Amino acid sequence: NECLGTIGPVTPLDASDFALDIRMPGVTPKESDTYFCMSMRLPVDEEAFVIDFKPRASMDTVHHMLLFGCNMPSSTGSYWFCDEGTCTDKANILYAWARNAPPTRLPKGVGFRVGGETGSKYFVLQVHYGDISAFRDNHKDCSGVSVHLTRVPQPLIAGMYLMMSVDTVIPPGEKVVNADISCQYKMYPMHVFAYRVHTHHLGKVVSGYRVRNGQWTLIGRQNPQLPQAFYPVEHPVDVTFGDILAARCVFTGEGRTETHIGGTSSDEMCNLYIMYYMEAKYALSFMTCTKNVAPDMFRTIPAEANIPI
């Protein structure tokens, strides 16, 4: 969007609410495929709730944008290159915008709990400039996100469920290898409202289900070779004590002359982010599954999970 000026990024809306305008401080990227970051310090030393995101992306030039909660940004400058990365501590993804992709909205009563003793103190924005054919120096970009914070305790708290395989091995050629992930859900109910799949250049399809009394209910199916936005769940799925979260990333060997789990694009990653909410009295902000606790259960995984789209 047009560049802010002197107006200031923090806007008080009342004694409970404030708005943050988190924007690049007028940047001009010189190479194609540049990653710019900046960070805003939360202006309250206490528990706040993030209850709305509005993207302020130039349709011309911004490919994807990521907003993260952490306590320690990588750099301290007004903006910096983040091929390096985002936060020194754990980066808690809050919001992922991609150019052409359905724009998910937070369900009524939902907040991301930030600040206080335990929450994030810092928002880190990350902007992917793609084709730099618009950036004929002819402009300075101020793309970013608007964020509505309240100190009012929200009845529903958002969280992030990450499922990643960490022992996977793809020999070269081997037309199909399956990374299977599965954990038994032991917490109070979560309502899954969005997912994001992330593989590197090998993965062909990634699929996530809740399985209850042997019934496979789809959470998401995506080609991981697309813009990695949070896609919206076709039917919001509850997950309950006794359920199994199961995921499968499907990988090809074809193309490789030597793969394992690592951070290098030469390495692979089978990741599924399930964004969810819980009742506030029960809410956990993060859960992880790195095991495969029920491998004999993938025997009845739906056909759809083994085929591209």
Binding-site residue ranges for Cu(2+): 63-64, 128, 198, 200, 269
Nearer to Cu ion, 151 or 198 (CB): 198
Distance CA 265, CA 4 (A): 36
Comparing CB distances to Cu ion, the nearer of 45 and 131 is 131
Active site residue 200: yes
128 lies in the binding site for Cu ion (CB under 5 A):
yes
Minimal CB distance residue for Cu ion: 128
**CB-based contacts of 272: which residues, under 8 Å, 6+ apart?**
162, 163, 164, 181, 195, 196, 197, 206, 208, 220, 247, 249
Catalytic, 64? Answer yes
* The one segment of 54-62, 116-124, 161-169, 266-274 that binds Cu ion by CB under 5 A: 266-274
Residues 221-240 that bind Cu ion (CB under 5 A): 238
Our answer to whether residue 269 is catalytic in this structure is: yes
Is residue 198 annotated as part of the catalytic site, yes or no?
Answer: yes
Q: Which is nearer to Cu ion, 238 or 304 (CB)?
A: 238
Q: How far apart are CA 284 and CA 194, in angstroms?
A: 16
Q: Which stretch binds Cu ion (CB under 5 A): 6-14, 56-64, 72-80, 201-209?
A: 56-64
Q: Select the residue interacting with Cu ion from 63, 210, 221, 248 (CB under 5 A).
A: 63
Active-site amino acid positions: 63-64, 126, 128, 198, 200, 269
Q: Can you give the binding site for Cu ion, defined by CB under 5 A?
A: 63-64, 128, 238, 269
